[PDB]
């Protein structure tokens, strides 16, 4: 009967959907750390600087 064949494919459908879910989570986690670090590094880059007061010679 059709009942047996339906159950077999059902298991396969669940496993496939889990794979595509894993890709999206892993990619978002990788891009999270890069975007956070870039923001913090740029903030330090703009604000920081050195200034010359006076120059003397002998």
């Amino acid at each position: 009967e059709t009942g047996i064949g339906t159950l077999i494919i059902f298991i396969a459908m669940v496993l496939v959907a889990a794979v595509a879910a894993t890709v999206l989570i892993n990619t978002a986690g990788s891009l999270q750390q890069r975007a956070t670090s870039t923001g913090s590094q740029t903030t330090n880059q703009v604000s920081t600087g050195l200034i010359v007061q006076s120059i003397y010679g002998m």
């Binding site: 890069r34 670090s37 870039t38 590094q41 740029t42 880059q45």
Partner: protein, 57 residues
């Protein structure tokens, strides 16, 4: 300039370019880097060749 005695009638013989990476950048290999220059209807394409000896380094 190529003339020391009188730099007025001289021309540029050497050019130096200071290069750094951008903030939060992945490493760059300079052997795969190409340099383009345009001057007086001449388009140049310069390339570095890596070597153990007799290398411009």
């Amino acid at each position: 300039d190529n003339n020391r005695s009188n730099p007025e009638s001289g021309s540029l013989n050497w050019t130096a370019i200071y290069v750094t990476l951008n903030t939060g950048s992945s490493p760059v290999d300079l052997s795969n880097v190409s340099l383009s220059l345009e001057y007086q209807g001449q388009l140049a394409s310069l390339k570095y060749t890596p070597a153990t000896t007799n290398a411009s380094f």
